[PDB]
Amino acid sequence: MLTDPIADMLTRIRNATRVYKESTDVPASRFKEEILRILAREGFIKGYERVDVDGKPYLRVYLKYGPRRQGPDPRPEQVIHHIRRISKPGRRVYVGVKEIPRVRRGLGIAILSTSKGVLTDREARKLGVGGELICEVW
Amino acid sequence: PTINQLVRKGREKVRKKSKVPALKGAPFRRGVCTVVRTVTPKKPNSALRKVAKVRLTSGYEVTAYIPGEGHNLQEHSVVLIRGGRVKDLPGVRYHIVRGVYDAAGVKDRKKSRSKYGTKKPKEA
RNA sequence: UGUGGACCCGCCCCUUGGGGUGUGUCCAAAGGGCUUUGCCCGCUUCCGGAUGGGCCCGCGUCCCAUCAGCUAGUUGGUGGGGUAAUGGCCCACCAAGGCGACGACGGGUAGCCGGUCUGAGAGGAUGGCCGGCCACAGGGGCACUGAGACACGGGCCCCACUCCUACGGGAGGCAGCAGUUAGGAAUCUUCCGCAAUGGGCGCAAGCCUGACGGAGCGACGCCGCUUGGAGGAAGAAGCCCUUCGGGGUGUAAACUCCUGAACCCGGGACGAAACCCCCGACGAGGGGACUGACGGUACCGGGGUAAUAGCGCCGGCCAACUCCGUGCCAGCAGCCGCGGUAAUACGGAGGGCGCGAGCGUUACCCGGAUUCACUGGGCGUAAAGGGCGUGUAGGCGGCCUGGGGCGUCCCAUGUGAAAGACCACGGCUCAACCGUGGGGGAGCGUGGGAUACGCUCAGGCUAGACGGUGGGAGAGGGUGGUGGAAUUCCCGGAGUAGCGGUGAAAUGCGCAGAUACCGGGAGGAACGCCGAUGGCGAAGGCAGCCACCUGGUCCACCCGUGACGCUGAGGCGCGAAAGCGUGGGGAGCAAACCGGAUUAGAUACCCGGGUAGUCCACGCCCUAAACGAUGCGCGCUAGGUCUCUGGGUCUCCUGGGGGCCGAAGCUAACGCGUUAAGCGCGCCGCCUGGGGAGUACGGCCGCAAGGCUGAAACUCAAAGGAAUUGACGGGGGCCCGCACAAGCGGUGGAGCAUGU
RNA sequence: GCGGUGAAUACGUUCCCGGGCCUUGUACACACCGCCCGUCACGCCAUGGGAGCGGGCUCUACCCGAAGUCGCCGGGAGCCUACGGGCAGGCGCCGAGGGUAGGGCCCGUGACUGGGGCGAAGUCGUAACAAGGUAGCUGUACCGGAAGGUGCGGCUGGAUCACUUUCU
RNA sequence: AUAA
RNA sequence: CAUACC
Ligand SMILES: NC[C@@H]1O[C@H](O[C@H]2[C@@H](O)[C@H](O[C@@H]3[C@@H](O)[C@H](N)C[C@H](N)[C@H]3O[C@H]3O[C@H](CO)[C@@H](O)[C@H](O)[C@H]3N)O[C@@H]2CO)[C@H](N)[C@@H](O)[C@@H]1O
Ligand SMILES: [Mg+2]
Ligand SMILES: [Mg+2]
Ligand SMILES: [Mg+2]
Ligand SMILES: [Mg+2]
Ligand SMILES: [Mg+2]
Ligand SMILES: [Mg+2]
Ligand SMILES: [Mg+2]
Ligand SMILES: [Mg+2]
Ligand SMILES: [Mg+2]
Ligand SMILES: [Mg+2]
Ligand SMILES: [Mg+2]
Ligand SMILES: [Mg+2]
Ligand SMILES: [Mg+2]
Ligand SMILES: [Mg+2]
Ligand SMILES: [Mg+2]
Ligand SMILES: [Mg+2]
Ligand SMILES: [Mg+2]
Ligand SMILES: [Mg+2]
Ligand SMILES: [Mg+2]
Ligand SMILES: [Mg+2]
Ligand SMILES: [Mg+2]
Ligand SMILES: [Mg+2]
Ligand SMILES: [Mg+2]
Ligand SMILES: [Mg+2]
Ligand SMILES: [Mg+2]
Ligand SMILES: [Mg+2]
Ligand SMILES: [Mg+2]
Ligand SMILES: [Mg+2]
Ligand SMILES: [Mg+2]
Ligand SMILES: [Mg+2]
Ligand SMILES: [Mg+2]
Ligand SMILES: [Mg+2]
Ligand SMILES: [Mg+2]
Ligand SMILES: [Mg+2]
Ligand SMILES: [Mg+2]
Ligand SMILES: [Mg+2]
Ligand SMILES: [Mg+2]
Ligand SMILES: [Mg+2]
Ligand SMILES: [Mg+2]
Ligand SMILES: [Mg+2]
Ligand SMILES: [Mg+2]
Ligand SMILES: [Mg+2]
Ligand SMILES: [Mg+2]
Ligand SMILES: [Mg+2]
Ligand SMILES: [Mg+2]
Ligand SMILES: [Mg+2]
Ligand SMILES: [Mg+2]
Ligand SMILES: [Mg+2]
Ligand SMILES: [Mg+2]
Ligand SMILES: [Mg+2]
Ligand SMILES: [Mg+2]
Ligand SMILES: [Mg+2]
Ligand SMILES: [Mg+2]
Ligand SMILES: [Mg+2]
Ligand SMILES: [Mg+2]
Ligand SMILES: [Mg+2]
Ligand SMILES: [Mg+2]
Ligand SMILES: [Mg+2]
Ligand SMILES: [Mg+2]
Ligand SMILES: [Mg+2]
Ligand SMILES: [Mg+2]
Ligand SMILES: [Mg+2]
Ligand SMILES: [Mg+2]
Ligand SMILES: [Mg+2]
Ligand SMILES: [Mg+2]
Ligand SMILES: [Mg+2]
Ligand SMILES: [Mg+2]
Ligand SMILES: [Mg+2]
Ligand SMILES: [Mg+2]
Ligand SMILES: [Mg+2]
Ligand SMILES: [Mg+2]
Ligand SMILES: [Mg+2]
Ligand SMILES: [Mg+2]
Ligand SMILES: [Mg+2]
Ligand SMILES: [Mg+2]
Ligand SMILES: [Mg+2]
Ligand SMILES: [Mg+2]
Ligand SMILES: [Mg+2]
Ligand SMILES: [Mg+2]
Ligand SMILES: [Mg+2]
Ligand SMILES: [Mg+2]
Ligand SMILES: [Mg+2]
Ligand SMILES: [Mg+2]
Ligand SMILES: [Mg+2]
Ligand SMILES: [Mg+2]
Ligand SMILES: [Mg+2]
Ligand SMILES: [Mg+2]
Ligand SMILES: [Mg+2]
Ligand SMILES: [Mg+2]
Ligand SMILES: [Mg+2]
Ligand SMILES: [Mg+2]
Ligand SMILES: [Mg+2]
Ligand SMILES: [Mg+2]
Ligand SMILES: [Mg+2]
Ligand SMILES: [Mg+2]
Ligand SMILES: [Mg+2]
Ligand SMILES: [Mg+2]
Ligand SMILES: [Mg+2]
Ligand SMILES: [Mg+2]
Ligand SMILES: [Mg+2]
Ligand SMILES: [Mg+2]
Ligand SMILES: [Mg+2]
Ligand SMILES: [Mg+2]
Ligand SMILES: [Mg+2]
Ligand SMILES: [Mg+2]
Ligand SMILES: [Mg+2]
Ligand SMILES: [Mg+2]
Ligand SMILES: [Mg+2]
Ligand SMILES: [Mg+2]
Ligand SMILES: [Mg+2]
Ligand SMILES: [Mg+2]
Ligand SMILES: [Mg+2]
Ligand SMILES: [Mg+2]
Ligand SMILES: [Mg+2]
Ligand SMILES: [Mg+2]
Ligand SMILES: [Mg+2]
Ligand SMILES: [Mg+2]
Ligand SMILES: [Mg+2]
């Protein structure tokens, strides 16, 4: 079965971008969606939208890359350089507000889930909470 | 392994067995010579090597090496051993202190004097 | 006497034995001193405070599972005893419980902590000075007295040891300060003082303190300080090297002047102002007196001498090279390694490098070691995927909504002693050392809040999973049956001199007629072609044909259930071959064995025989190169091509399976690449340098053979994987050469010449 | 060095010796006159099994049992008394330790004995690495001075294929 | 035979 | 090259 559906998405995305797709489909959940809301806001995607494949509900993510490059290998720079699940099943990772990590000196984000809802690193620290550290993205 | 496995079992820490049971831990140990011998090296070495079988206040019978060109140890000489394998004679792990007990300091030695244990050549 | 307290019973409040209240009963005392009618110190009962304790609880606290079962006061009940007090703390009676893989029970090791060392940190190691708690006082028990002891310098008893002994009997207890002795690599004075601080008793004066404050020994550690400072040759002597010119030690020395550690003389402490005494009141307050172990020390002033330098190193790692001696010796060596007659690696010398009242060595801890990896590793070939399944516990778990608020997060608050650690300002001339202040702090307690994610409870869903209906391919498994080819043997026929076998042979078979050939028969075993580029199975493995019994699977329909899922320590089953037990069988083949060859030998390869075995049934054994040397599940990430098997609009589309090539990507490389070794998540298993060793031991299993589990001493600096360039092969392919072959003349014999 | 006279034979590349290029395997690199294996001999070392001796700890049953608390008695059977009672003494439970029987574990010692690991130049062969000259390795079974050989089955981590031919 |  | 044995 699908043991972690968040990693599934996070990965689904990582996979798609490395072959430069225009978009990719993840099967849908509000929680998954509530993450894409942030990916989108912070500039990591072009955004997403609830499409509908074979009558079951998916979230089409629209990916985003650099410009074409120079010399041999013109494949463009990735926008999502790096994106990885931190907390996982059978190793949940929770942090105090005093422990929310500075990712790449802030050049990257770290989505975490708090009782004020899903939030970036900057968001929670400048709002006073902590929670389950979901994933770093940079 | 999986975390649940580290949880279940865990990492086992490493035991570090001594290279030198001069018991006590102690820096040195006294014993008596119960034979002085000559020994052949191995590998690409050849020479005649001075060793002793010592019986220790540790209650241990170990074979020590007798450094220096000149030595004065006999089949009843008391001696102080001190750890320091000799790379060429297998099973020789301790050295003998030159300058302590029956063992004489090396004679007319002028350089590495405190190993070998010789006084300070005196004049003006 | 009864302020008041204690006890029984009743009543109120409270909620565990807390606080009232009524009757009844029970329970108090001690005197001493004077400045002698009032003070000082005592005594008695009760309530409260302070300080110190007892007991109980949550959580945390090393190693071995080669220690898996443990327990009879054991687990709970009732009633007692006991205590300051709860309690199987102890006792009687009753119930039959309690604990354990979240590691009981046993074994091993250990005082625990604040802290200490190390580390970027997470971690690792440690618990020595100092402070807190615990335990012990020759070993084992025990109580007495007390507010407190089961009592280190108190009591009793038993034990071991030393001592006295008139033979019956007694006496001891440094793990208090010193000190002796023993063991050891190794650890101090039988010092001074109660002046300060603290303690005990005393109204006080005082007394007692080996607590303590000081001195003493040891470079054992830290910190501070000296062995001098400025001039001084184009550069003495000696020693060193040399290209025979020189170059080095080197401004170093000598020597010129300048300060003046040591040492001498003089002054000389702080630490000490209280207790006591006087005025006031024996209060507040004021006045007075006494007191220094350290110590004639610290410190201040004058006088004043050029006045200890060692140890390690110099092949690379690793700062620093030249002669001589040695000759695989003598030796060095942390690792790699130096020495075999020209050694920057050995021993000396000159020179040089590094530290310096120290410098080296050995031992031990952390580090580098992401080398037990949580941070932060791996397992196709380097060590590592369990032989395969089924499944227990456990771990983990799709989408939507609501409750709760266990996890998680947040606010407030309590606790986190001092020392130490961090920072500042201070005191010793600095520092070491010490004083003052500030700051931080993991973790636990409480009160309030959040609800995304995890958890749980209640509903809902169909996309995971299972089911239904129709259809398919298959050496998947079990049982009975049956078919032809061959080998062997037996009978008959015909036929005669050999057959067989090898490099060559022999052993062997054959005139009792073999070999070849024909016909008939018995049997045991295995199934040619079809047939692999194939199929089936979880693995081991599975192939003549027929029938029955029976397992897995794939597709179409999108019909039903509604998260029923994944993985899986133990358990249970399965598991080529060989091997074992009991019967059966036995054609061919064939360990052992018996012969023939070969050979230097030939306990082998070759040849002729041949027993177990190979086959069956039943029962064991449980292994393997049990291999894709690649655990299972799910999701994602170009394509091309070949093939097996479904379905559909059937140039092709769409599933499942088997190959090859390759995108991205990965990999040490080789390789892998929708049948991952890519990108991810869940779970199990396993690895931690080589040898010793799959050994020993213990356990468990087996009839056995053995299997499973599985070390240590000791020992090495490697062992390894992939690839590269060579060389090589009794590997391939291509090709040369008087290389052979084809030729013609020689040498090897003779006599002599010449060389050895 | 010089001229005179003046031949034979070569089918062919299988063998013998060398050499070049390409390819394959490799455990070789002072490079096959390479590497390497095991028994055995000499020597040093740690160690398993072990009849029997010496010592420690613990458990079970039975018996003896100091001190001491606690319990019962405390009597014309001792002392005290206010007659209530106290004390002395006595018995008993428990109880340190001791002994008899059986068992479990831990250390020393040890006749005899099994293998191990190391140590330039002792011995026998030549198993492995090239198709290592009989592909190798492997589980198992028997056999042999030794490496090893053979059976059966498995693996490829085997070169791809025409009498034995050891060592450097 | 052994070491380079 | 320097060694070791028959
Ligand atoms: N350590 C070797 C072990 O024993 C064997 O090897 C041992 C013996 O077989 C071997 O003996 C060899 C011998 O083969 C060879 N032909 C001659 C050689 N002189 C011997 O060597 C032995 O003996 C001499 C003295 O005689 C020693 O100086 C030398 O160090 C030692 N290795 O010496 C070894 C002991 O050092 C196994 N083959 C080996 O697998 C195993 O590892
Ligand atoms: Mg050392
Ligand atoms: Mg030296
Ligand atoms: Mg009253
Ligand atoms: Mg009353
Ligand atoms: Mg009450
Ligand atoms: Mg009452
Ligand atoms: Mg009264
Ligand atoms: Mg009076
Ligand atoms: Mg109190
Ligand atoms: Mg009971
Ligand atoms: Mg009670
Ligand atoms: Mg009770
Ligand atoms: Mg225990
Ligand atoms: Mg202790
Ligand atoms: Mg600690
Ligand atoms: Mg580290
Ligand atoms: Mg101490
Ligand atoms: Mg201490
Ligand atoms: Mg003592
Ligand atoms: Mg005493
Ligand atoms: Mg001594
Ligand atoms: Mg005093
Ligand atoms: Mg005092
Ligand atoms: Mg000067
Ligand atoms: Mg002066
Ligand atoms: Mg002067
Ligand atoms: Mg006084
Ligand atoms: Mg007065
Ligand atoms: Mg006053
Ligand atoms: Mg001078
Ligand atoms: Mg250098
Ligand atoms: Mg010269
Ligand atoms: Mg010599
Ligand atoms: Mg020389
Ligand atoms: Mg040389
Ligand atoms: Mg030198
Ligand atoms: Mg050196
Ligand atoms: Mg470091
Ligand atoms: Mg580490
Ligand atoms: Mg590793
Ligand atoms: Mg291998
Ligand atoms: Mg391997
Ligand atoms: Mg497998
Ligand atoms: Mg197994
Ligand atoms: Mg295996
Ligand atoms: Mg399963
Ligand atoms: Mg389950
Ligand atoms: Mg669950
Ligand atoms: Mg969920
Ligand atoms: Mg909910
Ligand atoms: Mg909560
Ligand atoms: Mg503190
Ligand atoms: Mg620190
Ligand atoms: Mg200051
Ligand atoms: Mg402070
Ligand atoms: Mg709290
Ligand atoms: Mg709270
Ligand atoms: Mg809510
Ligand atoms: Mg539900
Ligand atoms: Mg069906
Ligand atoms: Mg079949
Ligand atoms: Mg016939
Ligand atoms: Mg006839
Ligand atoms: Mg005959
Ligand atoms: Mg005849
Ligand atoms: Mg015939
Ligand atoms: Mg016939
Ligand atoms: Mg027959
Ligand atoms: Mg096939
Ligand atoms: Mg298959
Ligand atoms: Mg197979
Ligand atoms: Mg079927
Ligand atoms: Mg349906
Ligand atoms: Mg329904
Ligand atoms: Mg089997
Ligand atoms: Mg069989
Ligand atoms: Mg049988
Ligand atoms: Mg038979
Ligand atoms: Mg035969
Ligand atoms: Mg045969
Ligand atoms: Mg038989
Ligand atoms: Mg059978
Ligand atoms: Mg068709
Ligand atoms: Mg396919
Ligand atoms: Mg590529
Ligand atoms: Mg590559
Ligand atoms: Mg490929
Ligand atoms: Mg996958
Ligand atoms: Mg890999
Ligand atoms: Mg294993
Ligand atoms: Mg090993
Ligand atoms: Mg090892
Ligand atoms: Mg085995
Ligand atoms: Mg065993
Ligand atoms: Mg048995
Ligand atoms: Mg290799
Ligand atoms: Mg070749
Ligand atoms: Mg010829
Ligand atoms: Mg001749
Ligand atoms: Mg050739
Ligand atoms: Mg050419
Ligand atoms: Mg070549
Ligand atoms: Mg070439
Ligand atoms: Mg090549
Ligand atoms: Mg050879
Ligand atoms: Mg033994
Ligand atoms: Mg005994
Ligand atoms: Mg008794
Ligand atoms: Mg008694
Ligand atoms: Mg009595
Ligand atoms: Mg007893
Ligand atoms: Mg061979
Ligand atoms: Mg050869
Ligand atoms: Mg081979
Ligand atoms: Mg045998
Ligand atoms: Mg073998
Ligand atoms: Mg044989
Ligand atoms: Mg075979």
Burial bucket for residue B98 (CB in 10 Å: 0-12, 13-18, 19+): buried
Q: How many domains does chain B have?
A: 1
Rg of chain A, C-alpha, whole Å: 16
CA nearest neighbour of B104 among B75, B68, B76: B68
CA nearest neighbour of A6 among A134, A119, A132, A115: A134
Would you say the CATH fold of A81-138 matches that of A3-80? no
**By the 8 A CB rule, do A47 and A60 touch?**
no
Query: With breaks defined as C to next N over 2.5 Å, after which residues does chain B break?
Result: none
Q: How far apart are CA A10 and CA A84, in angstroms?
A: 7
A81-138 has CATH 3.30.1490.10 classification: yes
Q: How far apart are CA A108 and CA A42, in angstroms?
A: 9
Q: How far apart are CA B32 and CA B54, in angstroms?
A: 5
Q: Which residues, in sequence order, are CB contacts of A112 under 8 Å at separation 6+?
A: A95, A100, A118, A119, A120, A121, A124, A130, A131, A132, A133, A134
Hey, what CATH topology would domain A3-80 get?
Ribosomal Protein S8; Chain: A, domain 1 (3.30.1370)
Structure's resolution in angstroms: 3.2
Domain extent, residue B54, equals: 1-124
- Retrieve residue A103's tokens: 């990712």
Buried b vs exposed e over A103-129: b needs ≥16 C-beta within 10 Å? beeeebbbbbbbeeebbbbebbeeeeb
Q: Which residue has the tokens 């225009």?
A: A22
The structure's method of determination equals X-ray
Query: How is residue A104 annotated by DSSP?
Result: G
Q: How far apart are CA A24 and CA A42, in angstroms?
A: 19
- Retrieve residue B38's tokens: 């000559």
Give the closest nucleotide to B40 (alpha carbon vs C1'): D119
**By the 8 A CB rule, do B90 and B40 touch?**
no
Distance B50 CA to ligand 82 centre (A): 64
- Retrieve residue A68's tokens: 């074409």
Q: What is the 3-state secondary structure (H, E, C) of B35-78?
A: EEEEECCCCCCCCCEEEEEEEECCCCEEEEECCCCCCCCCCCCE
Nucleotides of C under 7 A from a protein CB: 64, 102, 124-125, 183-186, 310-313, 328-340, 347-349, 359-366, 372-374, 377-379, 394-401, 407-411, 449-454, 462-464, 563, 565-566, 633-638, 663-665, 678-688, 712-717
Q: Which residues, in sequence order, are CB contacts of A81 under 8 Å at separation 6+?
A: A108, A138
* Dihedral Cα A38, A44, A50, A53, nearest 10 deg: -140
Give the amino acid at A71.
Answer: G
Give the CA B29 to C1' C433 distance in Å: 38
Query: How is residue A106 annotated by DSSP?
Result: G
Q: Where are the domains of chain A?
A: 3-80, 81-138
Nucleic strand D contacts from chain B, 54-73, CB < 7 Å: 61, 63
**By the 8 A CB rule, do B103 and B96 touch?**
yes
Backbone angles phi, psi at B63, to 5 degrees: -100, 110
**By the 8 A CB rule, do A104 and A81 touch?**
no
- Retrieve residue B113's tokens: 């004097």
CATH of residue B22's domain is: 2.40.50.140
In three-state secondary structure terms, A131 is strand
Q: Which residue has the tokens 């865990």?
A: B10
- Retrieve residue A24's tokens: 């990719």
CA nearest neighbour of A138 among A105, A113, A109, A98: A109
Q: Which residues, in sequence order, are CB contacts of A5 under 8 Å at separation 6+?
A: A27, A29, A32
Give the amino acid at B56.
Answer: L
Rg of chain B, C-alpha, whole Å: 20
**By the 8 A CB rule, do B116 and B65 touch?**
no
Q: Is A62 left (phi over 0), alpha (psi -120 to 50) or beta?
A: beta
How many beta-carbon pairs under 8 angstroms link A with B?
A: 4
Q: How far apart are CA B36 and CA B54, in angstroms?
A: 9
